Amino acid sequence: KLQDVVNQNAQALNTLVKQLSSNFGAISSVLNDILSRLDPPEAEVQIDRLITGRLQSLQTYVTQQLIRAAEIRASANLAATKMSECVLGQSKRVDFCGKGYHLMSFPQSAPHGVVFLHVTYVPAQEKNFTTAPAICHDGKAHFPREG
Amino acid sequence: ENSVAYSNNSIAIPTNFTISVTTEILPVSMTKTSVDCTMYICGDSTECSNLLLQYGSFCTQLNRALTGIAVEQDKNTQEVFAQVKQIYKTPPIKDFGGFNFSQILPDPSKSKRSFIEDLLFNKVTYIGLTVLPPLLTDEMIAQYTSALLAGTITSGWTFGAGAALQIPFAMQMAYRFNGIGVTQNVLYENQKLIANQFNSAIGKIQDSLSSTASALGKLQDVVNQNAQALNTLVKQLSSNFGAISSVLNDILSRLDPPEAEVQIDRLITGRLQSLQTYVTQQLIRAAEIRASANLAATKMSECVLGQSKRVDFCGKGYHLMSFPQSAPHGVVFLHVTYVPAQEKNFTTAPAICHDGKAHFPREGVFVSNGTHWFVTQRNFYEPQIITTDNTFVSGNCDVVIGIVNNTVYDPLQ
Amino acid sequence: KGIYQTSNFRVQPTESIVRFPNITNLCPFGEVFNATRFASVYAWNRKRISNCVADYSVLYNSASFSTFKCYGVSPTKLNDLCFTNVYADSFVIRGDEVRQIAPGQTGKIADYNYKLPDDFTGCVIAWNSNNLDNYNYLYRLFRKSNLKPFERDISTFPLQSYGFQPTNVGYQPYRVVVLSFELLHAPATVCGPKKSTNLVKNKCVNFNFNGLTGTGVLTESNKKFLPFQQFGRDILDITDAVRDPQTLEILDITPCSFGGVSVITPGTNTSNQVAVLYQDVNCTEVNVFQTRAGCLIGAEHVNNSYECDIPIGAGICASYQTQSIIAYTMSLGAENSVAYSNNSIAIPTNFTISVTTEILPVSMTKTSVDCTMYICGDSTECS
Amino acid sequence: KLQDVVNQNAQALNTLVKQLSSNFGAISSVLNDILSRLDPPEAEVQIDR
Amino acid sequence: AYTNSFTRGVYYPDKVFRSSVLHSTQDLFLPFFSNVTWFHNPVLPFNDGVYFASTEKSNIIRGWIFGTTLDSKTQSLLIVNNATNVVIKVCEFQFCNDPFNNCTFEYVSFKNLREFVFKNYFKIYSKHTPINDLPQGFSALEPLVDLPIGINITRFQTLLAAYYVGYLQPRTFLLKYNENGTITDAVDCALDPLSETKCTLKSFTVE
C-alpha cells in the first residue's frame, strides 16, 4: 500500500519529465534549439506547439495529482478515524479493527503512511453443547442475564 | 408539524413494535472498460500512428489509467463480497424458529441465485472500446452472498469474529434484541408474531421490487452514467474538430502526406482531448464508486457480520441484522430493524424516595399508570413492581429535583 | 508474477478489392478545356458532369496549365476517388488576377464576380490565352454587397471590359477552369479510371466501394435496404453495411478480428514459461483453452480448483505449478456446512490474542512544480 | 472551513472570467475586434485559438 | 379552406439505411399539425418546398409547372404524368395565362392519396397509400427522382379534384427507424416544449 503510493508518484513525475522530450509537432523538443535556429516571428509558430503540449501535460499531471490527493485524503481521514476510535479507544465496529473482537491498537510511523498493530481476541477451541432459550423451574420461566 | 407533548414529568413508552425490513442499495463496481487509445485516435492507420507518437506517453498513460480503474473494480467487488474466509451452507432442515428465508437463500432449481436476487438482476437493463469481464462472475458473487447468508443465519456475528459457531436462530434474535436494550423475554414471548412480521415484511420486499423499476435507481444511474460517457466518447469520433472530415480513411484517400498531416493533427488533437476528458471523468467516477464500495464493505462488516449501534447507519430503526443480496454491478442490503410502534403517555419521576434515601433504576425508567408506580425497560412497556433488585440507592431525597415519595418492595422482607 | 497487457493483435488484410459502377464512357472534359469560346467572368459558365469516367491524369500531366492548385484533394489522388457531380466552371480573367480564384480571397474578382466557398473542395486550373483570345470579355466593378459563394449575377453602369491585345505578361487573358467536386453521401457518378475487381467474402480485405475506403470482412446480409439506399450505418453512426455498385447485393462490413494480448507469467526468478491471452476472440481467429475473457494459449486446463493466483477474468485464475502454467476455475474458499439444529450451540473453550498489521497511506511526497520553468525553462522568449 | 469553500467557489469563477481577457496566441481576445479587423478566412484561424 | 396535416410529410432525409435507431436530422420538412391549403388552377408560392397531396379519383390531377414567372426570358420546370411517360423538362416556355423552346434538360420514367415533397438541386419524394380529409396516421415518403437542373424557382402551378398544399420549413426532426429500416414515428423538435424534451433526451418516451 505505501510502496504503490510512492511508485504512483514516481511514475507521475517520470511521465511529466519524459513529456519534455516529446515533439508535439514542433521542429524540436529542446526549446533552446528552436531559439538558436529561428528568428522570433517564425519561432513563435514552433514554440507555441511546445507550450500547448507541455501545458496540456502539466494540466494532466496536476489533474492526476488532485484526483490522487482525494484518495490519499480519504485514506488519511480513515487513518485518523482508526487512530481516534481504534487506538484512543476500543471500537465495537466489527472488522473495522482487523479480523476479530477488538481489544486495542498500537500505531507505528512508516514512510508517508501509518501502521496499526491491531490486537484482537479471536476465539479458537469450540465445543458443541445442547442449549435452550429459557428454563422452567416452578411454572415460571427463567432467562439468563449475562449468559 | 408536531408539537411533542413534553413536560417536566411526562414520558411516552411503546407498548408494541414493528419489525421492518428496509432495502438499502449501493453501487460497488463500474463496467471494466478498456479503450485502445491507438485504435480510437488512429483506427487502422500507420500515417496517423506516426503522428500520435509526437505526443509521447499520452496514449500509454490512458491505458495505464484505465487499467488502474479496471483492476480497482475487481478490488472493490472483492472487498465488499469476499469478507468470508469459507463458503458456508445452510442445513437441509430449515428449522429457523418460524423465520422464512426461502425468498433470499439460493434456489437449487436455477445460476444458483435466490428469489429476491432474480428480481434485482431483471430490474436493471467495436472501435477500440473493449469491455473486460469481472473477475467474479455473477454465480460466484451469488455464492459469496449465499455464504454470508448461511453464516448470518446459522451463526450470528461469530463467523466474522472467529470460527463460525452454530446457535439456534430464535436464540440469535434474542441476542439481537439484547443488543438494543430490549430484554430477551420480549422475543420468545412474541416469537410467532416476530417471525410473521419478518415473513410479511420480506413479502413486501418482493412486491416493492417487482412493482416499480425506480427502486434500483442508484444502480441504473451508475449504468446510465457510463453509457452516456461511452455515447459521448463515440459521438466525438464523428466531429470534424476543424479538419476537412471526421473519416480518417477518407483524408488519407484524398490528400498527400504534406497536406494530410495538417488535417490529421486536428483529429488527433480533438480525439486526444476527448479521450483525456473521458479518462478524467472515469477517474473521478471511479473515486465515487470506491467511496461507495468502501461504504458497502463497511455496512457488510458492521451491519451484516455484526449489529451496528451507529444510529440510522442501518436503515431507519434500532438495528438487528442485515441480509446481503447480489445485484448487477452493486449490492443490496435487507436491513432488519426494530421500530417501536404503540406508545402510551405515562407520569414519570427521575428517582423515588422510600426511607429518606433515594432509589434509581438499574436499567429502564420509572413510570406510573396514574395510581401505582412501576419500573420498565426504556424501549418496550413492561411494568415491574419496584424493588431493591431493579433499583439502586444514592444519597438522600433533598438534592434530586422532581423526586417522588413512594414505597419500594424488599424481596427478603 | 502477474498478467500484463502487452500489445494489440489485429488480423491483416489478405487482398485489395475495388468496386466502381460498370460505366465505360470517358467524361466530356475535352468539350470544356479545349472549347473555342470561354465566357465573360461576371456571367461565368457552368457545365455539370456525371455518369462517366474521368481520367484526371490527362489533365494533370500537361504542362500547358500554368497552375493546377487543388484545395481539398491532391491531384495524384484524383484517379482513385469518385464523386457525385464535378461542376466545371469556365471563364476568362486577367493573368495577374488568377490568384484571386481560391477559397477565402477578397478583391474585385472574389467579392463581385465569382466567389469560391471558404471550404471549396476542388481544383483551379488556369492558362495563358494571349495566343488565342480585345474588349469582348467583361467583368463587374460595382455591387451593393459582396456576392455569395457560387452566386451568378446579370444586371445593369457596373460592367467593364479588359484590354487583351497581343502586344501586352500579367495583363494577358488567362482562361480559368474550376472543378468543384461534390463529395456528397449518395450514388456517385464520376469515378477515376481505376479498375474494378472480383468480390471476396468472409476474408479480411482492403475494400474501396465508390471511393469509400476501409478494411474489413465482407459478408452477404439479410438487411432489407429500400431500393434507393446505398449504404447503412450502425447504432454508433459508423458504416455497417454497403450495396455492391456492380450487382445490387447488401454486404455487411465486419472489422477484421482484433484484441488486446495479455501475457500471464510467474516471476522471471521462478520461470520463463508464459501463457498468452487473446482478449475477446474465439480460438479459431488466432494446450489451447477457451474462456469468457478470451482464447488462452500455453496454459493447461485443470478440473481441480485452487485459490486465485493470477486473475484472468470470468471466474478463471492461472498459476505456475507441477511443471507448467495451469488455468482453473478459482476456489472461493473451503466449503463448510455449519452444524445447525434448533437446540445446538458451539461455545469457545479457549482463545487467541492475535496481532494483525494494517497499513494506510497518510501523505504524498509534497511536490511543487514551477509551471513557468517547466514550460519555458530559462527562456524570456518563451515566457 | 465554510469561508474557504465560499472563497474557492468565488476564486474559481473569478479565474474563469479573467480567462476571457487572455489571448491564447490570438491577435486579440476581443471577439468583435478580430471579426471587424480581419478578412473572414484569416479570422477563423484567430477565433479558433 | 384549411385542413390540419397531423403528422404527414416525413421523408427519408438521406440515401442511408439505419435500423432500430432514433436518428436526429435537420432539413426542410412540413411542420407537424400545420394548416394545409385545400384547393379544388391557382399559381402558388413555393418558398422552400411544397408538400402536395391528392385523393384523386381517376388521375384528374396529372402534373405541375415550377419557376419564377412561367414565361420566356426565364427557365421553367414542367412535369406531366400522362400514364405513358413521366415527361420532365425545364424549357423557357411562353405559357398561356391558364394552361392545362430553349430547352436545357429532359427526362422520362378515392382510396389512394398520392403524396409528394418537391424541394431544391431539384428532388421529388413520393408515397401512395390507401385510406377511407388527411389521415391521423403516419408513413414515410421515399425518394422518387433526384434531378440536377440548377433552376431559380419560387412559384408553381398544377395541371389537370382536391389537392392539399403545405409549405416546408427548416426544422430538426427525430426519426425512429424500425428493424426493417423504415420510419415508424417522428418528433418535430420545434412543435412544443414536450417535443423539445424528446429531442434533448433522444427519446419518444420521457420519464
CSV table of C-alpha atoms in Angstrom, one decimal, chain A residues 13 16 58 61-62 65, chain C residues 365-371 373-374:
chain,number,residue,atom,x,y,z
A,13,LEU,CA,6.8,12.7,-12.2
A,16,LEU,CA,5.9,14.5,-16.6
A,58,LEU,CA,1.1,19.8,-16.8
A,61,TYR,CA,-0.3,15.8,-14.2
A,62,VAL,CA,-2.0,18.3,-11.8
A,65,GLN,CA,-2.3,14.6,-8.6
C,365,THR,CA,5.6,13.4,-1.3
C,366,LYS,CA,5.0,17.2,-1.3
C,367,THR,CA,5.8,18.1,-4.9
C,368,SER,CA,5.8,21.6,-6.2
C,369,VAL,CA,6.3,22.3,-9.9
C,370,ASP,CA,7.2,25.8,-11.2
C,371,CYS,CA,4.9,25.9,-14.2
C,373,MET,CA,10.3,26.9,-15.6
C,374,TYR,CA,8.7,23.5,-16.6
